[PDB]
Design a protein around this ligand. Structure first.
Ligand SMILES: CCCCCCCCCCCCCC(=O)O
Ligand SMILES: CCCCCCCCCCCCCC(=O)O
Ligand SMILES: [Fe+3]
Ligand SMILES: [Fe+3]
Ligand SMILES: [Mn+3]
Ligand SMILES: [Mn+3]
Lengths: 289, 289
């Protein structure tokens, strides 16, 4: 439904804007899935116990379905950016979406490398909080942006996507793979993939932080939205973590500590608020363009 | 609105499917905008005549606005792929969209390198066919997919996007930059950018070809759709080319021949049909999955 082109504006694009800096970062730090050596993970995998394989398969399942979900569910944000006339942010989000596709790809390649070929949905059957987040909260909230690209809708969506799903859940998951792999010096392919996905995620989270901060600065009502949505989801995220532990008698393999993981995740969620609240009362110019 | 996850299916993803082969290709052949040396183009640029700069600025304007448009307008196709349950195609399209963003980026960097900072919309004022394609036909047709992800809607959208805008117009534009730059051995940064964008475009067009072929094979009614939409747009594309020549008295700089360019573009459009018509009557298995 088009009238003008952002790329043709006087002065061009502002390469110093956050989304364009992130885009350039993603270009400089682009990594190739074909560069990750998976040829050693199967040997480690076969040496694990049944329980250890079960746990790691279930963690992997949660990951790859989550990547897939974000790949799909990020799309309405691109639409919102277009509605706001923010080409640089739209550009950034194309990279974001591509990266999530590539995350989906690399987990799939790891699964293939370790010999996993069965339907994995069964690993989500007993994780109702997971399904509530990834099959309901995330798509429903993101999809709202198609009809309502308002600052309030953006903030709600960014909380769900960037601050909870990435900021709380994915980071806690990376910590889980850390606990599984590092001290035992196993699964070097997984380890490498997690490092690289982590690196991409740093940018995705920077974008989400930026997005909430600029709306918060512009209108303190958006702080309301932020705080409310965070407080709604933190317990649901924590329930996901709890349900996962419960399936293993709260004593999973790899010596994972339920209390450690709840503390970690809580910290990750809690630390989010401060990072946004600092935008309150700031000239939007100090935050944006 | 989610129920299952494609990434969790028995047997995983099919790495041999066309969209996944293209995705892997795009990963292997990823190019960095920061690798293109632009530091020599300004010197060449300043040696051109006013007329030559005018013509090339207008060609560049058409390009970068077109990249921007496709970056934006590809999005509804991702939605259609999701509706069809085709995760591999969705994945591919994230890469496609990212690449168009990066195309937009690199043309913007070239403009900056040559010292162009004015608002460029004025270069489109006298190109009404351009505006009709890029501001009306392309967004309207693509946007239809949001509400109607049917095979017929997909085919119409793919004709507009892949077969006309890329297949006919962009290819003719690459030929224009070839005529401008190669024999004179100028603008090595432009030349390099055009080669790299060309390489990405080969994949985008492969995807569009695949998409039309699989719907055509599945139902010959989709051949109707294809043929009709092509025949509707070819004259509009040719009018775009004509209007561009007319502004320069049908004798632009760089010794460009109107008749040569009309023949080239016509050939590019015409050659499209055969590539799709061969899918008629074929088992879809010979074309897809
Ligand atoms: C004890 C560990 C429980 C950790 C929870 C695992 C859930 C994985 C969430 C995946 C989200 C991916 C989102 C993204 O890539 O941006
Ligand atoms: C005599 C030359 C006239 C050529 C027409 C120039 C129009 C440029 C179209 C740009 C389309 C970009 C689409 C894409 O990148 O996929
Ligand atoms: Fe992410
Ligand atoms: Fe393209
Ligand atoms: Mn990810
Ligand atoms: Mn392009």
């Amino acid at each position: 439904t088009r009238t003008r082109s952002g790329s043709l504006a006087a002065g061009g694009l502002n390469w110093a804007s956050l989304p364009l800096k992130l885009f350039a970062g993603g270009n400089a730090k682009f990594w190739h899935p074909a560069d990750i050596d998976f040829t050693r993970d199967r040997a480690d995998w076969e040496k694990l116990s049944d329980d250890e394989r079960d746990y790691a398969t279930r963690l992997c399942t949660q990951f790859i379905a989550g990547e897939e979900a974000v790949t799909e569910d990020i799309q309405p944000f691109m639409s919102a950016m277009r509605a706001e006339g923010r080409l640089a942010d739209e550009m950034y989000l194309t990279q974001f979406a591509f990266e999530e596709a590539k995350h989906t790809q690399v987990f799939r390649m790891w699964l293939d490398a370790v010999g996993i070929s069965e339907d994995l949905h069964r690993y989500l059957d007993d994780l109702p909080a997971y399904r509530q987040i990834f099959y309901a909260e995330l798509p429903e909230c993101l999809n709202a942006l198609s009809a309502d690209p308002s600052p309030a809708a953006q903030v709600r969506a960014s909380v769900t996507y960037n601050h909870i799903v990435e900021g709380m859940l994915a980071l806690t998951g990376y910590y889980a793979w850390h606990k599984i792999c590092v001290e035992r010096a196993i699964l070097p392919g997984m380890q490498e993939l997690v490092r690289r996905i982590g690196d991409d995620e740093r940018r995705h989270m920077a974008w989400g932080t930026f997005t909430c901060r600029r709306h918060v600065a512009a209108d303190d009502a958006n702080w309301t939205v932020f705080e409310t949505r965070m407080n709604e989801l933190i317990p649901l995220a924590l329930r996901l973590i709890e349900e996962g532990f419960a399936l293993y008698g709260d004593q999973p393999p790899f010596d994972l500590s339920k209390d450690d993981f709840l503390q970690y995740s809580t910290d990750k969620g809690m630390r989010r608020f401060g990072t946004i609240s600092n935008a309150r009362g700031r000239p939007v110019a100090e935050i944006d363009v």
